[PDB]
């Protein structure tokens, strides 16, 4: 079954299971292989990942190429991309990322994510480590191990969701319904981070996380976010911080860039911009697809 793949090197460790770079000896094709040692049967994360990636064919969503499924092991065969955005951002310490690349990346991520939301999928773990880049200039959503298929309208899904730094305030305040808006939030934080090359809200805890978001965007009241003060994990002793001048949040950003990031980081999930609607933002009026260094 794995007879035609030759391991090249280990890549790392996923939501679950272990990832190697491999090549197809017959075709020459380079692949990432997620191995799953198989208890409680097939992990629910693996079941969701496989069903949902098979549905999602998009230029900006990692391709699941095959599932090799033995009584012993389950292997997911992905197309191989050269790195993740995190490693790219670290490497850009002193250059920094050219605007045209930041823009092109965001345009692409918003394309992958719109397609996901159109196909009733929540990703629920967008972070730079899960966003993969090739040498031609593509970026792609990866790691659908935390993803789920959603209904219209949403039910309550897992609370214990989104790497903390990228986690939307409706999750942190315990709203019984979150939806597509939590993935827009995470992409907001990453847009910010591609520009500054540090994380926008690096909290150490749930309360530290909220407070950091509050010091940047202001503590939300019932005018900005109708319903906040009734949310389960809202506390009326919350310090009430002034909203900051948004040109301070990410200073290198021009007017259209600020406008966009502000709509992505809108408190009220219902007023937060959709991935679909964001594609048409004037920010992207001059978008190209430059290759990275």
């Amino acid at each position: 079954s794995m007879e035609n793949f030759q391991k090249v090197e280990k890549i790392g460790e996923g939501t679950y299971g272990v990832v190697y770079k491999a090549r197809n000896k017959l075709t020459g094709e380079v692949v990432a292989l997620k191995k799953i040692r198989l208890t409680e049967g097939v992990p629910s994360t693996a079941i969701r990942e496989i069903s949902l990636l098979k549905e999602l064919n998009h230029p900006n969503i990692v391709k699941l190429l095959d599932v090799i499924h033995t009584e012993n092991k389950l292997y997911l065969v992905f197309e191989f991309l050269h790195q993740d955005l995190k490693t790219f951002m670290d490497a850009s310490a002193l250059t920094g990322i050219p605007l045209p690349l930041i823009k092109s990346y965001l345009f692409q991520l918003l394309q992958g994510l719109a397609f996901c939301h159109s196909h009733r999928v929540l990703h629920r773990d967008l972070k730079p480590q899960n966003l993969l880049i090739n040498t031609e200039g593509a970026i792609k959503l990866a790691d659908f191990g935390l993803a789920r298929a959603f209904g219209v309208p949403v039910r309550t899904y897992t609370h214990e969701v989104v790497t903390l730094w990228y986690r939307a305030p409706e999750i942190l305040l315990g709203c019984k319904y979150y939806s597509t808006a939590v993935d827009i939030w995470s992409l907001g934080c990453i847009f910010a981070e591609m520009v500054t090359r540090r994380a926008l809200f690096p909290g150490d805890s749930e309360i530290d996380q909220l407070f950091r978001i509050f010091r940047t965007l202001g503590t939300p009241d019932e005018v900005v976010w109708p319903g906040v003060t009734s949310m389960p994990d809202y506390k009326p002793s919350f310090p009430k911080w002034a909203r900051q001048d948004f040109s301070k949040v990410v200073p290198p950003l021009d007017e259209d860039g600020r406008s966009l990031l502000s709509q992505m980081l809108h408190y009220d999930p219902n007023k937060r911009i959709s991935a679909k609607a964001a594609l048409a933002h004037p920010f992207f009026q001059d978008v190209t697809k430059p290759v990275p260094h």
């Binding site: 208890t39 409680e40 049967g41 097939v42 992990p43 629910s44 079941i47 969701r48 496989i50 069903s51 949902l52 098979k54 549905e55 599932v67 499924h69 009584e71 939301h117 159109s118 196909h119 009733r120 298929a149 209904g151 219209v152 309208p153 039910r155 309550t156 899904y157 897992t158 939806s179 597509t180 959709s274 679909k276």
Partner: protein, 257 residues
Amino acid sequence: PDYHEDIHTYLREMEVKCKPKVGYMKKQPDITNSMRAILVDWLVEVGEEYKLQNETLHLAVNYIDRFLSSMSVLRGKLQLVGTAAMLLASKFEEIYPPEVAEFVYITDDTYTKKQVLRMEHLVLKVLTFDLAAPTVNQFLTQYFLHQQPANCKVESLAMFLGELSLIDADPYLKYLPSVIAGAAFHLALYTVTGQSWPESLIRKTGYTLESLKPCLMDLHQTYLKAPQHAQQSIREKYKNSKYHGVSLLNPPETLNL
């Protein structure tokens, strides 16, 4: 309405792709519609004992009907197929699925844990890991947003009717989830409020009362004969206050179509 319409459209396409094959039961050498009726009804009981989502029940049943479309199963192995299917649907759909021992336990040790887990891999293989099937429940829930105003009795009764159609492969294997959900929503709406399938849902779905009629005439007789059907766990479940006691409501004598 962010993506509600992209989503309806996608679910309309996937429901055709995910469809059981309407005539599979004649090709089954050993099991019947009646045996499948028994197994579904037990699955309802199981979902009640473990407090599973209605969606999880609709999903498992989809997995079973599609599995039985290509795989011949002896009558003493049907419950095994349905156990794995409910275990798979739990993993897909539940925040906290029951653990594999809980599934073994409720078969009353008909099967070992090895068998349940071996069946699970087999069901995955036959279904090619294609588990995000559209369901009647997924369609109803969108149709509910078209009520004026919302009515909990209407919702719980539409769910109750959509659920009864899971039991009887003849005639409901021949209808798509969106159509059954159509009939169910209209029949619920008419029974409780006197109203009909709204124009806004004609706009959304392209279905009219006329297109819904054949499914609707069947669903009406199911509702009328529900108290006398051999299988009775949906009727008892929907007597609970959680679903506003709707199985207690009187079916209309006629639909005036």
